[PDB]
Symmetry: C3
Subunit: 366 residues, 3 copies
């Protein structure tokens, strides 16, 4: 018979949605606001706000359909615009589907906000807008379809709870391609980081789709992995430089959050402590190797770390929820690696195409 929405789940997920919107408006905007040069802040805030608005529109017009509708292994469909095929009472899992639409839309928003906040007043605004349309449509959307919309990576049992590939790796490589082709308020950075943290609970727990024990797990693991990464990074920084800094504390937080994103509803809390530690160190490594586009280093490295570790610590003998029936750790790690690899290439190529199309049309300079 018909799916019926559970009101507790509706409630949960609307609030989670509002918490993820919070992480863009104003979370990410304040994070970049205190990182970039003061002469550029007003214009950065405006470009995050405007592209946020743009993403919201594109999402309901066609983006939700092309990401989550029936299609092939790579794309959904645009058979219906503006949510027209979706009755107001339609249910997806245990919530009204409209709530699923907003929740997933808020994901596209933070993902784009991440990129846009770094590239603002480096590439011309015109060129950001063309990049956003191209890359959302042809990278974000299909990669979401592949991982969460029944496409290719989902059909091979890829594990990515809340978006190590779809959000983090995806965006990291778009930013780095953009960076290749080209701090004044630290309390403001702390504030953004803090907002990003609180919001991420909606991100990570809400990705369970219901207020059940998987969301609880995801919640607890977020707390733990973030804390362990803060300490991971901070100890690494004390060692490497003799003093620990506020920006190091914040970066570590971000590193654990990223690292735990793919893993959070699949692993045990011991797992999460380990993932956090490693992610915190790997992120300190990443930036040290490599300019606000260091942010992409952390999303990228820690995204890869977290997608790998999900394939280990999901195992029931390590405290995780368990692999799917008949799956071995070695097989699963192979699928995690293939998923990472495909995500990197796909987004590299699409980012390239988007930037060039912008360059040849309006140019990338100010």
């Amino acid at each position: 018979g018909a799916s019926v929405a559970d009101k507790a789940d509706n409630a949960f997920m609307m609030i989670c949605t509002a918490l993820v919107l919070f992480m863009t408006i104003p979370g990410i905007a304040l994070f970049y606001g205190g990182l970039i040069r003061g002469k550029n802040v007003l214009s950065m805030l405006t470009q995050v706000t405007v592209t946020f608005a743009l993403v919201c529109i594109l999402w309901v017009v066609y983006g939700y359909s092309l990401a989550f509708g029936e299609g092939n292994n790579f794309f959904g469909n645009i058979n219906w615009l503006m949510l027209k095929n979706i009755e107001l009472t339609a249910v997806m899992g245990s919530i009204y589907q409209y709530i699923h639409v907003a929740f997933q839309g808020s994901f596209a928003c933070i993902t784009v906000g991440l990129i846009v906040g770094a590239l603002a007043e480096r590439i011309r605004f015109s060129a950001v807008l063309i990049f956003v349309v191209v890359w959302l449509t042809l990278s974000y959307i299909p990669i979401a379809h592949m991982v969460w919309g029944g496409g290719l990576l989902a059909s091979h049992g890829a594990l990515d709870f809340a978006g190590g590939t779809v959000v983090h790796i995806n965006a990291a490589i778009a930013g780095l391609v953009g960076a290749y082709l080209i701090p004044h308020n630290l309390p403001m950075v702390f504030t953004g980081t803090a907002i990003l943290y609180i919001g991420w609970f909606g991100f990570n727990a809400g990705s369970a789709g219901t207020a059940n024990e998987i969301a609880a797990l995801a919640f607890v693991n977020t707390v733990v992995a973030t804390a362990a990464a803060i300490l991971g990074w901070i100890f690494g920084e004390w060692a490497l430089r003799g003093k620990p800094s506020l920006l190091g504390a914040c970066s570590g937080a971000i590193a654990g959050l990223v690292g735990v994103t793919p893993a959070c509803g699949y692993i045990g809390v011991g797992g999460a402590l380990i993932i956090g530690v490693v992610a915190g160190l790997a992120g300190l490594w990443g930036v040290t190797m490599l300019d606000p586009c260091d942010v992409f280093g952390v999303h990228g490295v820690c995204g890869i770390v977290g997608c790998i570790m999900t394939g280990i610590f999901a195992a029931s003998s390590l405290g995780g929820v368990g692999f799917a029936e008949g799956v071995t750790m070695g097989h699963q790690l192979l699928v995690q690696l293939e998923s990472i690899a495909i995500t990197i290439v796909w987004s590299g190529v699409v980012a390239f195409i988007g930037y060039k199309l912008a360059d040849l049309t309006v140019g990338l300079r100010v």
Copy 2:
């Protein structure tokens, strides 16, 4: 049988309530804080905090009762002070009534915060406090009764989901009457605007009273109408001045949110995109013509109340008018509701300011 509270609804509504309190403390305070002259900030923040407190007290003493209790077409009652007739387990709709008390009390708070943040250190504080008491009691309270408490406008089938009349038009007119009778931190304005946005999800979806498909519709329409307005305003501003600004982006956001407030749980998402666009442009128009903040709440409030009477129609993607109601009749009711709201609040604001003027005077 007895009404039974649904715990999911309770949960939803307590979180929505906290989100709407958020939009006053600190949302609206930070929004005005970066708009007004620096020499006036500390005193503005204090007055918003104090009057917020005052509203909370008046609300539980008599305000909730006079707004939502059985009365007239215009007022409820004050038969019981301090929620005394309300058992702890009493249920209103699908939630404990105490939650309905806090939710609606947070609405009075943001409404007043709106007015107070603009009038701080223009009219003396004494006079703000007299104005607040008079106008909350005699404008906010009866207009809420008329629209959401079974009074006059609700009995004619007026559509106003979350307060285009009650909050926006009502407050716009009080502010403008106050303005007639008399920008240093733009990142702070962004922050306030952002908090106002996040909170507004509690405002708008919470006005459904339950975590159902109407709250979901309200949620999605808020996302969409805000985004469309941001763009609406921003494209208008690029045209009119050659450059788009951060303050324009934020104003657009506010315009869509105001515009979608009355409409949000009655219209379809296509409707919401249209409303947002128009509300964004109408708000850019409003300020350009011209406490500009009141221009936007007022013009966009009127825009949204009108458009609710169109796009609520099933053939336009809305939830549908009540049985036997035509679009033309419904538009007529929307207009009557707007008209009555403007006069009622204009007259009561006048009375409140004068009473303050004649008692303490309206400066230093």
Copy 3:
């Protein structure tokens, strides 16, 4: 049969938890950030962030178990580390127990954040870290066990809904002992205060454990008591100094919130108005006589006392337990306050000293 989690309660309590984490990160950090000297902000924010992280780790390792597991009247146990005895589906009250772990963990975090934000760049960081480990383990944890974990004060029917003893008095005394042994952005203070306020709805209503009428009561009483304290303080300050200030408005808010913390799900809304007024004035008195600790301490004591009066049904509260008189209940409230003060005074002393003798408390 087995306890089954109610999903609405899960949802409610995960959100409440996030709201309490919010009060530390960034709430308390911004509150202290605008109070302390500018030269010290960056380092204060770092120390709050790091000790927050530390508390989260210690909590899941052993702290939750030692606070809420079966033990004696004072401590739980550490029979299992890292939540190992807790199945993912285990239920505590009407929620998954993992949610209870996070909710109570976020309490330990704000309690510590309160202390750490005041002592940062006064006492060396080394010494803060030793103090935190000692005092969380030996003061926060057993006092939570005693009040909410079935220990001594709970078995005598002590009333403390959301932590007038456990959080406020406990932390006040640790801070004052620390202060004895040793404002540049007022809008930032307002912001922190506002975040602390919003977060406190999760603190206070969430302490009911479920989205029911007790959480509703707790919610409403938080609105009302905070408002009444704002006014209480502000009228007191106008009188005492001729002008009311933004910092006074914020301090009053904090005073009503502290005051109403123990009382909030036991008293009626008339009770809450009175508690707020008194707490606002008692806090203005306290500071007038690390002033932050004065307010948490006085208003914590005020609230724990008033809980024992206004919980009475004849005053609009939910009622004392069967056979309990107001006089008996006040006696218990006093005994609880007294024990909390001495216990945390003694443990704070031990912690600071151990730090002093190991690293300095200076530089």
